[model samples]
Target: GAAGIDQYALKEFTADFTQFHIGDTVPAMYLTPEYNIKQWQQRNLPAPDAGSHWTYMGGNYVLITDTEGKILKVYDGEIFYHR
Candidate 1:
């Protein structure tokens, strides 16, 4: 269910991206520390050990994960819309 929402959000954001042309800028926001910490606790996950990096693309926000499914960091280019 969560994955489905993530996928849907990605698609929606991509569509928004295509609506704008090159040189056009959008506000980029990062996940709040509170949210991240809460999510981590809810999933019984741990903080990123090391060598974690946020992977950003033109569309879609991604959080790189390790083998244990720990979120290394969130990746996103523009963050005008909410998920």
Candidate 2:
């Protein structure tokens, strides 16, 4: 029951690989090298606050989290409609 806090639950139940919300602590997999999107400006993404990193959570979802992987904000690909 309490084991839900660990990845053991994920390893057992492979569910949807996307969708995160503000204040949610993301799994380490989502913040890996390939998932980490360093080029924020290219995507018209606003600068993340200090100590935060922009991570691509698949399905056009973007998650801004701190060094500990705590999600500070969530965005849908781009906040601005670049046209």
Best by TM-score: 2
lDDT of each residue in 1-83, candidate 2, tens digit only = 43221221121111156444556577877767677767777655557768777765543444545577777655554343443
lDDT of 1 at 21: 24
The true-versus-predicted C-alpha distance at residue 43 of model 2, in Å, is 2.7
TM-score of each: 0.21, 0.60
Worst 10 residues of 2 by lDDT: 5-14
Each model's lDDT comes to 0.33, 0.54
1-83: candidate 1 lDDT, tens digit per residue: 55322323332234333432222223333332222222332332234445332334344333433222233333333342323
Model 1 has an lDDT value of 0.33
Question: How many clashes in each structure?
Answer: 0, 0
Error of 2 at 47 (Å): 0.3
